[PDB]
Design a binder for this molecule. Sequence first.
Ligand SMILES: *[C@@H]1O[C@H](CO)[C@@H](O)[C@H](O)[C@H]1NC(C)=O
Ligand SMILES: *[C@@H]1O[C@H](CO)[C@@H](O)[C@H](O)[C@H]1NC(C)=O
Ligand SMILES: *[C@@H]1O[C@H](CO)[C@@H](O)[C@H](O)[C@H]1NC(C)=O
Ligand SMILES: *[C@@H]1O[C@H](CO)[C@@H](O)[C@H](O)[C@H]1NC(C)=O
Ligand SMILES: *[C@@H]1O[C@H](CO)[C@@H](O)[C@H](O)[C@H]1NC(C)=O
Ligand SMILES: *[C@@H]1O[C@H](CO)[C@@H](O)[C@H](O)[C@H]1NC(C)=O
Ligand SMILES: *[C@@H]1O[C@H](CO)[C@@H](O)[C@H](O)[C@H]1NC(C)=O
Ligand SMILES: *[C@@H]1O[C@H](CO)[C@@H](O)[C@H](O)[C@H]1NC(C)=O
Ligand SMILES: *[C@@H]1O[C@H](CO)[C@@H](O)[C@H](O)[C@H]1NC(C)=O
Ligand SMILES: *[C@@H]1O[C@H](CO)[C@@H](O)[C@H](O)[C@H]1NC(C)=O
Ligand SMILES: *[C@@H]1O[C@H](CO)[C@@H](O)[C@H](O)[C@H]1NC(C)=O
Ligand SMILES: *[C@@H]1O[C@H](CO)[C@@H](O)[C@H](O)[C@H]1NC(C)=O
Lengths: 490, 490, 490
Amino acid sequence: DQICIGYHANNSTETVDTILERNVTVTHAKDILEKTHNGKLCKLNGIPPLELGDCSIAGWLLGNPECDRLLSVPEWSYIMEKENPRDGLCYPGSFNDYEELKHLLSSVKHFEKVKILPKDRWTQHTTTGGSRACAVSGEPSFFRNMVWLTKKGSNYPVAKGSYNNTSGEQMLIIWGVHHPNDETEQRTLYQNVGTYVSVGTSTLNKRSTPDIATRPKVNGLGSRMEFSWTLLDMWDTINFESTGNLIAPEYGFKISKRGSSGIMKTEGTLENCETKCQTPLGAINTTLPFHNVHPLTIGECPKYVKSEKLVLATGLRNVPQIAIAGFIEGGWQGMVDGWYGYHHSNDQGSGYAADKESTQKAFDGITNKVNSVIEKMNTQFEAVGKEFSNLERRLENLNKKMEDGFLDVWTYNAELLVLMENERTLDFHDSNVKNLYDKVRMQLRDNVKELGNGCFEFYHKCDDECMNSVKNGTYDYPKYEEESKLNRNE
Amino acid sequence: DQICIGYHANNSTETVDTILERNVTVTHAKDILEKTHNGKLCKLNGIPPLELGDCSIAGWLLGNPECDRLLSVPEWSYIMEKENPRDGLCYPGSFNDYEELKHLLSSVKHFEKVKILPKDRWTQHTTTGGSRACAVSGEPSFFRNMVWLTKKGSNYPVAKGSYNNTSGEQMLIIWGVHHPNDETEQRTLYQNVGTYVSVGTSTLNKRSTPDIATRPKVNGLGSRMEFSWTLLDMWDTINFESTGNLIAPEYGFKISKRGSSGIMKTEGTLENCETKCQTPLGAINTTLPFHNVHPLTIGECPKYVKSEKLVLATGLRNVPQIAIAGFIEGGWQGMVDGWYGYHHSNDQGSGYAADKESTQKAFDGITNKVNSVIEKMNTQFEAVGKEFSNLERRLENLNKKMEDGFLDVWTYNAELLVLMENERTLDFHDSNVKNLYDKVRMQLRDNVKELGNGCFEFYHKCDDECMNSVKNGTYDYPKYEEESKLNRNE
Amino acid sequence: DQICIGYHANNSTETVDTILERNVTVTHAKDILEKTHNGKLCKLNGIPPLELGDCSIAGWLLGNPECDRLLSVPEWSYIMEKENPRDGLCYPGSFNDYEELKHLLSSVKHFEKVKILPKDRWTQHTTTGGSRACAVSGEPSFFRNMVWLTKKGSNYPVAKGSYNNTSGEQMLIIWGVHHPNDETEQRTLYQNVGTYVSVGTSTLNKRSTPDIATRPKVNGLGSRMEFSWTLLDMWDTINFESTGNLIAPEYGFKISKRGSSGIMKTEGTLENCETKCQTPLGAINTTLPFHNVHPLTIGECPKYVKSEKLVLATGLRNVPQIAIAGFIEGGWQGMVDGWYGYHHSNDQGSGYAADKESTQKAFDGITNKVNSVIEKMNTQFEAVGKEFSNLERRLENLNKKMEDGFLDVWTYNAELLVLMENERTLDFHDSNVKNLYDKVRMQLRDNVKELGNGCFEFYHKCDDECMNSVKNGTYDYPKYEEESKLNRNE
Ligand SMILES: *[C@@H]1O[C@H](CO)[C@@H](O)[C@H](O)[C@H]1NC(C)=O
Ligand SMILES: *[C@@H]1O[C@H](CO)[C@@H](O)[C@H](O)[C@H]1NC(C)=O
Ligand SMILES: *[C@@H]1O[C@H](CO)[C@@H](O)[C@H](O)[C@H]1NC(C)=O
Ligand SMILES: *[C@@H]1O[C@H](CO)[C@@H](O)[C@H](O)[C@H]1NC(C)=O
Ligand SMILES: *[C@@H]1O[C@H](CO)[C@@H](O)[C@H](O)[C@H]1NC(C)=O
Ligand SMILES: *[C@@H]1O[C@H](CO)[C@@H](O)[C@H](O)[C@H]1NC(C)=O
Ligand SMILES: *[C@@H]1O[C@H](CO)[C@@H](O)[C@H](O)[C@H]1NC(C)=O
Ligand SMILES: *[C@@H]1O[C@H](CO)[C@@H](O)[C@H](O)[C@H]1NC(C)=O
Ligand SMILES: *[C@@H]1O[C@H](CO)[C@@H](O)[C@H](O)[C@H]1NC(C)=O
Ligand SMILES: *[C@@H]1O[C@H](CO)[C@@H](O)[C@H](O)[C@H]1NC(C)=O
Ligand SMILES: *[C@@H]1O[C@H](CO)[C@@H](O)[C@H](O)[C@H]1NC(C)=O
Ligand SMILES: *[C@@H]1O[C@H](CO)[C@@H](O)[C@H](O)[C@H]1NC(C)=O
């Protein structure tokens, strides 16, 4: 008769990394890093994004004639913009606080265009001005959401306009100021020199004066146009007053829906698909705590790491070599129902077996460990992306260094955690096997003979019921004291 | 004769969490998180705070007529301000670089008011202006710390004034510019059109021109007042010059004391205590590495975590059940003098004991562990809290993201550290018990018989001195070697 | 005849720190923190720095007469500047966006000065102005890279100038505006009142008006000069137009070489030495992952921490005290071959030996642990250091807070890592020795008698070949079973 204690081995080729060893083959493993994507731009939670195409945000809001497909725009989940859009400001100029406007748009999901100043109200001025830069079918034209005021006859009276925000939400209003190239242009367009443009709300007070100077020609013109924006609160009034050089708004954008959104810089096209996580390269469908696809992401997505491999060991170490010995020589390829178990060879045949309580405890421990590593990570809606102007380099560097530092910290945390946990579980398995061996040895006492390979040779004749009692921890030592004593002394 | 090796158990119900198991009952535990406060706003280090009430910082510094109780304020530890103060700028207008001024006030603990420009020196102007917006008992009034200059007769001469900073410390000076509603108001107040206000120091050069336009009525007036502030260095001069629309200062604020302070947004009223860490909800009396009361604190306070439980295990696992058995079947409820011990049973009675060396070593190790966990955390006087305007949303988002990232980093660190250290301790105790058993077995050798439940049956007769020796570590094997061989063979 | 198992001891006094106990003496240890430096300012990768001396960046770029040595500066690796330089703006004034220019200079390694507007093209103006502030050898002078335009006779015509950037790279151009003290000075210099300065590029449009007011006297003058700068793109034009108060540039700075440089604030002088890492206190010459010299470094430098000691244990605990006993009583001073070994004593002699397999496994384990700790840290180039004005205190506080937080996080990480891995290394060594003892006992079975101090006593007579077989792992139990059974019973 004979009983042996050993562990389980299979044909797996999965390897993990520990703090003491590299490339350790294991029976089972779990990957906690996602490295794949579908390479497509899809809908987020069932709502399609807003595809700007070759247009810019300023061109969309101002009403560029080449962006006429965006006159009415439905609800969106995020905005897709090209890195260097072509159709922006057709008339050369600037746009004050552009990055602030984009950041505000990062948390707006829908707009509603409202006619706040009808074009026909300017009954004392000419409202049909145009330029060759914003030309449609050769003929000169202008922005579709703005009105250009010009003298009627040889008179430019004071232009006054007001609007009381009775819409129901905050309103975004954009106006502009014209900077001509020479005094002849100023006198031909506005008939007076020394003009002003005045805009004032309950919390805003701005006055601007045109600048007349020769400038390098952009898009064929030496003139410029400066645009400004404001947010009109509910039940608040905006006033306009100008003696010349005023580009007046005809529409105002009301914030109809609010939420978490962002601007994605991409050159692709929307495709028919759905997802819950979106990256500039493609969507992610995963349930793991890490990924290394792209730092910029929109939606509820796992943390981003600069790691090419993060594998948690779950099973034992694969050292399969092997009367039949025990755990000392190596693992077993015949035990296919548990991690740790027994092996017996008596008169009524032989065979393998598997201990239940120890395997259950080890399995529960490993499951708790992996769940604790996974669920201890906070996931929220992250839309990390910001634009800075050419005079805001220090702020941009600060933002970049902050993101880089946090990324490095989390990379170090994940790597060290996995490296140490793999070593601990590998030692845990050996400790469990040794504990089972010690328990069996203590329960058997002097009635058996050790062999040095994890196997015990019995002195008495142990049948199947006695082996079952041994495996279940119900061995009756007194029942075999007299029997085993005779052979031991002989 | 029996001598058993075991550990201590009690009737505790405290539970700790490890990385392999959850809700593990322990004999002793230590809490390293505090979740309680007294809910009272009250003194920091013996210095009462500055309670503004319904007044804002701008209203206090300018001298709003509704804040006359603040015209002479003593030392303070921190400033208490409401979220939306009611008595600020009685005259509608704006304040330039308001948030920078508040940040500067975050490091000032006392002000001294110095009369730098007496009201009676303006002998060629009228210095009794007022408005219905700032009215006391119905009659018009004005800010108590500034002078409104108006034409005398029908002339407004050029106004000049200067001050040389001979006070011994840095001084804060505030001036304002008036923006009328129409030309008639400008003519009846200053008699001139196209005026300027010039303020200049060694490192400052500012000139402003009033803007005349129709604006929505706030507090009944279409006019606005714009205020600016500067910091005048020691032995430096400030120059004022204006042809109209100048609100001139009468007082200056010199920084008498400097230190660490802050602005707390609460709606409560000062009460009586003597604390050292203040939160907007209440005070904290703690000696623990962490807390979860409120993020924004003033003083030296523990690190803030988004954790509801952080308990460190400092004792053994509580297995209640135990002739008398050993550590195989569980712990003892009758050994009340230590962690690891013995239990002997000879003809002269049977009682418990306690090994002192092992218990002392384990106690020292656990104490060093907890002190290493607690004492490596750096604590310092932190006054987190900053303010941003409507046109600085990117900066606000950057600040919030930085604070949140650091908070999650520390949360993960603390939770993982506690989870691992609990397993380390629970394995340490079992290893110590195993080592004690192994040492006793090795020094006893063949003279005893094992029983598999943790204790030994003696072959000779062991009196009290022999048990004292085996506990001591000076058991004499040759003394009983001949006697032991006699009964072992039989 | 007996054989013992023990470990290695020596005369070292190195000390390490663990999490359960402090001040542990180890046989071997590794220091991973450098605390030393040369104390000199040297050349980075063979390229000497730019020594500004008593000059500022503005003084060097504008051409202060005292800073006449920095007119043909060659390529540099980093810039050395003083905290309060003496030779800056000789004529009192300001410099708009000075900090942005200083930040841009941290990514430029060479400037080429090209003449864009020669001083002789101003045929209708006087270009020989000067002041007593910027005086050389008593006679008045001015900046060497700037031109002061004044009236010729009693006329100041419209001054126009332009330049097309055909140099081959981006250009840095600096201009200025003069602010006089009284109308008499303005009439004496420019003959016109109500002048302007206009500067325009493809993406820039600026207009300035002189300010005439009485100011405190700095350097003997009540007048100021305001300087501004731009970055001209390739194939772009800059236009200058002025009716007065224009300080036109004569040279433009071409970015000839771009890289990663920085500005170091020091009061020292350059010395003849080479280095790869530079700090304001000296140069670092290391391979270690950490240092604690100075937070601000330029080059490839280890991470900075606030620790005074970081030592990794790579050996055993030094407990030297010893028939010869084994590992129960202490280490051995005579077994200088490895870490773990045996001592044998038979009739053919006695001596010490070592087990090569276990020692090698432990050695590669410790080496792998050390390499894992050191190599996982990411290093790169970062010229840490930024400047902020007096109105940007919140931004400076944000930068300081972020840097301090990251430094604290990394210090905590390194300290806890060192403690836990030291503990695990000591436990590793103890477990290895115990495993060797268990292996020998298992292989030798009943032919030997245990003694309790790590030594076995053979029942048979074991010669040198049998001892070598025991060390080898090929001890033949049946070959000695018959003889060993005879002596044991008697
Ligand atoms: C571990 O395996 C990887 C590939 O799986 C190999 O690149 C690396 O060199 C291996 N490491 C060692 C120490 O053999
Ligand atoms: C704007 O409309 C609201 C609601 O009708 C009204 O209360 C408010 O007085 C209006 N504004 C003005 C300036 O009349
Ligand atoms: C995403 O993965 C889940 C697996 O949990 C699967 O059920 C689902 O169909 C997948 N969806 C897509 C769009 O691939
Ligand atoms: C263990 O299994 C044996 C099988 O022979 C059975 O007799 C015994 O009652 C079992 N004991 C327990 C506690 O399940
Ligand atoms: C642990 O106990 C708490 C309450 O004491 C309970 O809320 C929680 O669900 C328990 N966890 C498990 C895994 O049983
Ligand atoms: C201001 O006073 C100091 C000393 O009181 C003096 O040195 C300085 O010259 C004064 N300033 C002026 C402009 O006179
Ligand atoms: C126990 O050991 C100590 C050694 O310090 C000795 O002084 C004492 O006498 C011993 N006690 C007994 C009962 O042997
Ligand atoms: C330790 O012994 C070595 C001999 O190998 C000797 O060189 C060294 O000086 C000794 N150190 C001390 C502190 O005794
Ligand atoms: C550890 O050794 C150092 C010597 O470098 C000593 O200063 C320190 O006090 C020691 N630790 C303790 C706890 O005494
Ligand atoms: C500047 O020079 C480039 C070629 O070097 C030329 O193409 C461009 O037209 C020039 N600029 C102007 C305004 O003519
Ligand atoms: C720097 O360290 C290296 C170590 O390899 C050494 O050879 C070299 O002389 C050192 N140089 C200086 C300047 O210390
Ligand atoms: C010991 O093992 C080595 C294997 O490398 C073998 O060559 C040698 O003969 C063995 N010697 C003895 C005495 O077993």
